[PDB]
Ligand binder design. Structure first.
Ligand SMILES: O=c1[nH]c2c(Br)c(Br)c(Br)c(Br)c2[nH]1
Ligand SMILES: [Mg+2]
Ligand SMILES: [Mg+2]
Lengths: 416, 414
């Protein structure tokens, strides 16, 4: 007897993280949970073979089944095109999925008592709410080949007017130009999700923009957040002795760095990409971070392993060398996805399991059993010896052992 | 007898930094240096009164005299428009000046042995090379009022073709849109300045972009840097056992944070704005940072006090309250400007003076005499008592006393 998991959309990935993904399912999920798994191969070869259609199909399946769990993938560059003999330099699958679903990607460090922080003052968590739609991630950028005029136009759908703004007149040589946008409804959804997250955690909320420079573009984010706060959330914030404030991005980063944590940080798409990584590194390890896309319907989520594909480790693995790759981000993509699945299905057994696997992952590391990266955090990379860490397989074995113990003990406890 | 300073363009600023600016010239510069000072009032009231023309005139005067020194100014928002009863919400004077001059803004922490870092590993300096032209700082952004099509077009000056790219078709409601650009020549100048800085310091250089997303726009920065490195700087870097590498911005920040410093970080305009402040905060204090615009001609510079205008302190000052405002950024705008002036004029006396004032500023803080902000860095703001710091006037007095001693001793040593 396994737990009835329900419907989950899974997206397979690339390189080392693809290997780890299969170990996780084989050792940590499948022995305990029975799932109706809707699998999509987002490996670079399958994306190339389906002309990136598999990415769009996976995003539509998430809309249908409400929970997706995604493995980290390769976003190809010139070198990758040559390596895999790709038809095109395919766009980021994350950008494609996020553009289809919309929402806010909430990112937070996975804290272990024995991992030292780079920022000693951060005693409370920092949650990054990254706007997942538009801006640089759905932009139109091109090379300007020589002298000439770049203009940007708006034509309302009634056809009664046309506005033409001059971007730049290139007089000597060329350069680059780009157009980008955002949608009012997407900004409103981002605001609602940020206010709701601040209220569920009982922490103040800060929105960062550069509205002093982008008066109209960033000014709209600032105006939409303020308007929604004043009309729908101000009394709720006052009741919990918390607040909402707008800050300039350069002021916000410096304020975050010298703070003690304990706040929600609403970031525009590009800033949330950079800041979520910086904050994760500030808590100790870039890889020790959750990443959950919360869609506007309040029912759909996509949990992911946000970090790289770890090419260096993958090359070693191919050459038959020993590797010690951290699987926690991939584990927490599963647990966060299963926890949301459990919440939708009112499934106490799956809710218990998802939480238990997160506890086991943290308790394992805190018991002194970890991969090379985490061992380097504690000791410093030059002082790390083979005895200080477990290889990928040894670490997964330790986790499997600890998970079995935790679930067996919980079964025996509820037997009265 | 005073030192013959030469021609310097000065730009007066706003609020608390304006007060401090006058104290600096009165106590630290004028008693020792005779200057042909070309003064421009970039105070928010004068910018409003001249319809922001004073900003453009100051930028042209920098082109002419090759040295500018700028006080921090207000970039107005809605609240500022009401406060000063402004005709318009005037654009950032820094954006206006940088757009006219072009170049790279080099930013670096001002290190004092007794100020604790937030990042314990940073034992060597991090120099940020911020591209000072285009991108978000010369963008065309607007509100999209409802459903309709946003398009971006390119028309070559020969008129033989027209490219129209669809930005977005707004189907339900409106939003926002923007167009932005950069110039090949400006990118090439940014590359040259970054490679030259890395070679003068003997440190590796990293360029950060998001070329995996903005394949064409950021790809051009990456291609121009690589092309210039391979053709003009690779052997020079190999001779100093240093290197140049491109990194994705999110990877670069994490790598910088866990490093020990000791590198040049070439940043695009927007990233250099955020990262220069983050790095300054990592070394201990946001305000303890130099900011020098190095123009493409290799002759023109604009040194500035890049931090805030300290409105909170200014309000206290107006109410007759005691204030303790750090003047170091404004002092180093003067010293960096005078050092460049001295280099152009081959003036050993001015070169000595500029360096001496930087030494005095650091030695004064290291002797335990500092403003409230620096005292809070050492003790923690709740543990700071009035006896731990000097007010603005007391601190400026300490510096003046120390500067007089240093210059008198150097004169006697001749
Ligand atoms: O953009 C960012 N963010 C950031 C942080 Br959150 C830290 Br702790 C640090 Br030390 C630095 Br350099 C940065 N840069
Ligand atoms: Mg990232
Ligand atoms: Mg800044």
């Amino acid at each position: 007897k396994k737990i009835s998991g329900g419907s989950v959309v899974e997206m397979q990935g690339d390189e080392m993280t693809r290997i780890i993904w299969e170990l996780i399912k084989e050792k940590l999920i499948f022995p305990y949970v029975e799932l109706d798994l809707h699998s999509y191969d987002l490996g670079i070869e399958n994306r190339d073979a389906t002309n990136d259609q598999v990415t769009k199909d996976a995003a539509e399946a998430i809309k249908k089944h409400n929970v997706g769990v995604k493995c980290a993938t390769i976003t190809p560059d010139e070198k990758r095109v040559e390596e895999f003999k790709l038809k095109q330099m395919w766009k980021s699958p994350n950008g494609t999925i996020r553009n289809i679903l919309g929402g806010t990607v909430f990112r937070e460090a996975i804290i272990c008592k024995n991992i030292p922080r780079l920022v000693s003052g951060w005693v409370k968590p920092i949650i990054i709410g990254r706007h997942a739609y538009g801006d640089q991630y759905r932009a139109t950028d091109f090379v300007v080949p020589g002298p000439g005029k770049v203009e940007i136009t708006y034509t309302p759908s009634d056809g009664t007017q046309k506005v033409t703004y001059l971007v730049h007149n290139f007089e000597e040589g060329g350069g680059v130009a780009m157009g980008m946008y955002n949608q009012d409804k997407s900004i409103e959804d981002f605001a609602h999700s940020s206010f709701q997250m601040a209220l569920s955690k009982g922490w103040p909320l800060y929105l960062s923009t550069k509205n002093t420079i982008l008066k109209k573009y960033d000014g709209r984010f600032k105006d939409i957040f303020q308007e929604i706060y004043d009309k729908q959330y101000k009394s709720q914030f006052e009741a919990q002795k918390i607040w909402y404030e707008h800050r300039l991005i350069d002021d916000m980063v410096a304020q975050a760095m010298k703070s003690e944590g304990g706040f929600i940080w609403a970031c525009k798409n590009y800033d949330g990409d950079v800041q979520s990584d910086s904050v994760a590194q500030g808590y100790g390890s870039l890889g020790m971070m959750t990443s959950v896309l919360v869609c506007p319907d309040g029912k759909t989520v996509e949990a992911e392993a946000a970090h790289g594909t770890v090419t260096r480790h993958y090359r070693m693995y191919q050459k038959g060398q020993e590797t010690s790759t951290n699987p926690i981000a991939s584990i927490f993509a599963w647990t966060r996805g299963l926890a949301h699945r459990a919440k939708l299905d009112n499934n106490k057994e799956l809710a218990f399991f998802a939480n238990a696997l997160e506890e086991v992952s943290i308790e394992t590391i805190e018991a002194g059993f970890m991969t090379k990266d985490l061992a380097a955090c504690i000791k410093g990379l030059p002082n790390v010896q083979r005895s200080d860490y477990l290889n990928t397989f040894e670490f997964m074995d330790k986790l499997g052992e600890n998970l079995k113990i935790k679930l067996a003990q919980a079964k025996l406890s509820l037997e009265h």
